[PDB]
Symmetry: C3
Subunit: 110 residues, 3 copies
């Protein structure tokens, strides 16, 4: 069983819907971090400073390769609003996974 | 090169930092992140109203040390109570030190 | 498809974004993160000192990966310790949320 990390950067107000849709599908362990994209600029002692940012959330969930397609579609179809900046979803390969409490590995750790 | 990522209870953070230093492992970075533990309805929409604070720690380590870094994090983050989190490894295909331009193992 | 990640000093952020933008590279996201700089106990130790950094991530094709890495390395460099690191990880699937485009079409 091959592990995969699904990462998505989406608009913040889609978070709860994304959570609920993944829970409904038996997918748990989602974590979320606040992040930013860029929208003008100002100068101060030799550096440029953006004064305008777009708030996003980065969500991550770990699942088996067999669920990956389903999970990606759930996130995409739930995060979409039709406006620019709806975000991206990408997959990365996980070579080893350990559940801290039990020491379980692989599928036993999902 | 390998990236070790772990999401653990916040209060284990500097025990983990100390344990990795003792094993000669440095370069850790930490970001605050949230898990989920309840939901509220407001105008036909659902809003998560309950989050669990965690920290996301990342360390870049040679393949030779990857397994002991994983097991050091696991034993030090472990409380036995639920929510202890997870540790995982992803492959790094290129690594560069910004200041010197060194690449690969020279960049650790 | 490749993910470029960099931990850099926070005052380089908009310069790096400017440089990448001039090279036609878009989609950068940035997250505040912390490195370590003394300690007291409470029964666990507690570090009272952290060094602020910014994590930047940009997704690019294999073809541009080396250009992007050098732009970030060159723009983020100050010459003083703590300048950070840049690393590349493989992306196996990429989807643009608004359209459903995949792969190269999702950049």
């Amino acid at each position: 069983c091959r592990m995969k990390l699904i990462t998505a950067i989406v608009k913040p107000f889609t978070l709860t819907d994304i959570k609920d849709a993944l829970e409904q599908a038996g997918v748990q362990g989602m974590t979320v971090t606040e992040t930013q994209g860029f929208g003008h600029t100002e100068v101060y002692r030799g550096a440029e400073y953006a004064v305008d940012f777009v708030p996003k959330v980065k969500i991550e969930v770990i699942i088996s390769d067999a669920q990956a397609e389903e999970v990606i579609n759930i996130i995409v179809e739930t995060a979409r609003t039709g406006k620019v900046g709806d975000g991206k979803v990408w997959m990365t390969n996980i070579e080893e996974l350990v559940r801290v409490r039990t020491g379980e590995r692989g599928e036993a750790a999902l």
